[PDB]
Structure 1
């Protein structure tokens, strides 16, 4: 490679570094069928595209029981 240049448009999110670790865990699982974390920025940051962040919103809120993700029949 030449050098790291990642410039893109979407939603930038940070809160805490523990947060980072769950986004990774969720990317591992890919429970939402979307790869939300495009690049993670300086430890505590996650870059997710605005177009699909809505899946994260539901994951953050509803994942306690489950979020509505069943397109096996729809």
Structure 2
């Protein structure tokens, strides 16, 4: 084998799939997560997609007095 990449293959309806493509193109999560587009219902993404999403949602929380000294 020449090219190989560890990751996560996702299978989902045509709607959700287009949404992932939209999220990836717009960097709505702060960073790209799509390694390769495949089918209209399949996409190969980074293994740590959940962490990325968990990290993005954190910034969405309400700002407080410690928002800048801790983050």
TM-score (norm 1): 0.58
Runs of 4+, deviation exceeding 3 Å: 56-73
RMSD of equivalent CA atoms: 5.4
Q: Give TM-score scaled by structure 2 length.
A: 0.60
**Unpaired stretches in structure 1, ≥5 consecutive residues:** 4-8
* C-alpha deviation, 1:58, in angstroms: 7.3
CA distance 1:64–1:70, shift in 2 (3 Å)? closer
Tell me, in whole angstroms, the C-alpha distance in 2 between the residues paired with 1:17 and 1:67. Answer: 39
The count of residues paired between Structure 1 and Structure 2 equals 68
